Amino acid sequence: ALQLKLENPNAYNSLPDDIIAYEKVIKNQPTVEVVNSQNVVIDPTCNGDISQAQFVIYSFETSKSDLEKDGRYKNLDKISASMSNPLNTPDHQVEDQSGFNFKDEPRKKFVAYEYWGWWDINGNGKTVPIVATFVGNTMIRLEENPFPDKKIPFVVVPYLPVPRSIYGEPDGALLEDNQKII
């Protein structure tokens, strides 16, 4: 049965434990999601090169249970989720309109902020990539980039390229007058 262990691990792991002879990882997977362009603030100075972007700020909407499940967040008690309200910040654009929110504390939705940029953390002039997450006025996460590439996880693809710029241009930028005349 050992040869089954070297050659067919899938069948080997299906054997009874006798024949074969803590913290469980419930979820472990990448997360890819296209975000609203209103909730992303990319460095104005990055001259059309996400690579040389000094800072990108993402304002996502999350709950307290999600932060507790992640586990890498501190100062969770002084968050309150009140003020920080979804239909409460004039910057984040919630696609809810009606303004629904959960009554129970472990599921209340509040607005957070992610700062995926460079900073001088060592006090020596040179800048290093850092990650900062703050809600309201309190910072809940602050660390260097956990990704091996040490790069901002935001891929911006323009539709019609604009030279020396990061944003694109839809087809409708040339058809306003035509649409009006039609």
Partner: protein, 128 residues
């Protein structure tokens, strides 16, 4: 995703998906930056890849050893969503027939026997 999958994924999870030996990446280097080339898999791209593999298989013919034909056939089978047939074509190791080798050895021995017999016949002719 590839770069993050070489640090947050353990071997017991990659083997669970691929059911093969887990290839390990170096320590202080990015994964897939040098020895990988990721693109978009379209139907036309797969058709062209299969047509090029078949052209290569025709080109080698019988001149090259059948081991590389095994690689080409396994690649064709794996690309066409038939993985089990590929794992066979790969696991197949051809073995020589012992009887044929025995026949060749006996033929060589018989040839040397005829050479010796002819030499003895010449010696006998000289004596006669």
């Amino acid at each position: 995703i590839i770069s993050m999958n070489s640090e947050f994924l353990s071997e017991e999870e990659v083997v669970r998906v691929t059911n093969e030996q887990f290839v390990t990446v170096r320590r202080d280097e990015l994964a897939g930056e040098f020895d990988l080339k990721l693109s978009i898999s379209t139907a036309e791209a797969d058709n062209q890849k299969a047509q090029e593999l078949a052209f290569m298989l025709q080109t080698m013919g019988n001149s090259l050893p059948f081991e590389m034909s095994q690689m080409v056939l396994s690649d064709i089978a794996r690309l066409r969503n038939m993985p089990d047939l590929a794992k066979r074509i790969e696991s197949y190791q051809p073995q020589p027939d012992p009887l044929a080798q025995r026949k060749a050895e006996l033929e060589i021995a018989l040839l040397e026997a005829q050479i010796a017999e002819t030499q003895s016949k010449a010696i006998e002719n000289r004596a006669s």
